[PDB]
Design goal:
The structure is a homodimer.
Chain A lengths: L10 H4 L2 E6 L2 E8 L2 E5 L14 H6 L6 E5 L2 E3 L1 E7 L2 E6 L8 E4 L7 E8 L2 E9 L18 E6 L2 E11 L5 E4 L25 H13 L13 H10 L7 H6 L1 H7 L3 H14 L18 H7 L6
Parallel strand pairs in A: 8-12
Antiparallel strand pairs in A: 1-2, 1-4, 2-3, 3-7, 4-5, 6-7, 9-10, 9-11, 11-12, 12-13
The structure holds ligand QKR (2 copies).
One copy of the ligand O=C(Nc1cncc2ccccc12)C(F)(F)c1ccc(Cl)c(Cl)c1 binds next to strand 12 of chain B.
Amino acid sequence: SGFRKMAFPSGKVEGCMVQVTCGTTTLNGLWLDDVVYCPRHVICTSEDMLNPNYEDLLIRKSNHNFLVQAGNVQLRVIGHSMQNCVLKLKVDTANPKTPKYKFVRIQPGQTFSVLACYNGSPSGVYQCAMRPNFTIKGSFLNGSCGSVGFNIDYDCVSFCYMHHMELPTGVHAGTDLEGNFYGPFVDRQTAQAAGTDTTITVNVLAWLYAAVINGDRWFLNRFTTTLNDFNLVAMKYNYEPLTQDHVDILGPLSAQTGIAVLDMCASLKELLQNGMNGRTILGSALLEDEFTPFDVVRQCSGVTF
Amino acid sequence: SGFRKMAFPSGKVEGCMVQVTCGTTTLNGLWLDDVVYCPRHVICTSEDMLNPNYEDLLIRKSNHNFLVQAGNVQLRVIGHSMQNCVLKLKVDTANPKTPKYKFVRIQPGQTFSVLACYNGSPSGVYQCAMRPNFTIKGSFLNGSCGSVGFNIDYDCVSFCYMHHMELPTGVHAGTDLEGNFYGPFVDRQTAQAAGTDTTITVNVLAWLYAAVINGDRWFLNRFTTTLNDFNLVAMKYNYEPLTQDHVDILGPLSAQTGIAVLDMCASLKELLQNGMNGRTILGSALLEDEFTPFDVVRQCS
Ligand SMILES: O=C(Nc1cncc2ccccc12)C(F)(F)c1ccc(Cl)c(Cl)c1
Ligand SMILES: O=C(Nc1cncc2ccccc12)C(F)(F)c1ccc(Cl)c(Cl)c1
């Protein structure tokens, strides 16, 4: 019993975190094989950021300008190239702690663990979701750029996020490991704002199934709904549309609990129109949308890494 | 910016998790140097659990009865001893991944990270608090016994908890790494129930300071309170008494935000009286009590 916001064990990623210094800027890098990946904004000054020609800025840099540090050992940079908004620093030494890994780009609603780092040293791990507006509601201070988001699939680390910036509302924006930003963000000092966010419907349904598995049934009702009627109600409450793919992915939880997805949808509909009425679900007075259906199954079945 | 329930990176603890098998029971062990620590109930059957005599049960065991597995390598048990409710299995190999560590016993209200394991393999990491009733509201399934709680301040791992059991209400009980239970719990199938839980007041105050540091000020008010009047109110909502130690501990957060401790107490009294009125504090519609003053400072500065 119990349901917690649980992150993947961070050990495989800790052995990859390095410190990257270029000029006055120090941020984090991801050391995999003989390449250190980091945000390309490490090559920028406060003025450079206003209007940066990154090819022009990088052509002026030499390998010795990048100081890479893995623990108390300085790595030697033997090459540098840029791929989108990530800088790839070729180093002489392959990381002996390089795990089995993949670079994956996630979709909004998908969750991942963030290993927040400062000066190449991991300070904390937490669970996140890629919001429908492509921001993440992370916890980051100055120096956290280059901190990565990941999932574990068996013994394989799937790197899905690299931290680049904090938007004015305090939410976070970053790229996949190929340097492509999530969302309409740019690594330029310009007016940028997170779009109006929506609630990840399939994840709220997964979390309601997790509550039923844990013994919370007060919100259940005798009613069902059509997927079309549910989506009409979801549109009104700034909830993401629920697709047939979402209904299919919730199937195993529906079979285990005995509550069909459209039956759980009628529960969610009543919760949206009437609220919780002073009650809580899994110790929360709000509907939680940062547990995917796979996260609920993994936690309520105990998959290991 | 942002405030999340954040756990310590679990890497230093992952390299210590092993599988411990005794008879039909398989649980987790903590392999540090040449000793594997695990709950002593691994030697029991369901029949023994009602009134087990652990000294009697352990004297009948030999080293080859304990099967210790570290990854895909079987460790050789060369000794066994019991210290309170923890079994210490001496092994023939020192763990090369043993971090700098300490065994620390924590107080109610203290927080820690839990690395939940099954079959000696880590499955997840989450943040917990030792409740005032000495239970933890963990997330554990069968096979999670031996999973540990820890803090990693500096490069030293402070092991503070080892999971032993789940109480009937779904909450969890266990021991420090010296085998002493937190709370009035015993490792036996007798009628045991968690006492009525209370809210960790000092932690809610710390979290209200975290919200002020992050720009949330709607809950602040022009009032202050005496510590005695605050405790008389807080008690009626099942909140733990706030002591002078708690007030002193909140001093740095009070100095940083410019809000006196007893002034933040008056905001808490008002939130308890009114509720949030559809508002949230740090993305939460309830008052959070699982961030200590030390956690708030760590995360915000
Ligand atoms: O916002 C930034 N990073 C931070 C990351 N994460 C959290 C931060 C908290 C405080 C200060 C800064 C933070 C930044 F590095 F300064 C930055 C600024 C502008 C741009 Cl266009 C880019 Cl790409 C990057
Ligand atoms: O409660 C137990 N463990 C589990 C731990 N954590 C969660 C569990 C969930 C389901 C089943 C079991 C769980 C137990 F190991 F079976 C157990 C039972 C009685 C006693 Cl007195 C002792 Cl010391 C230990």
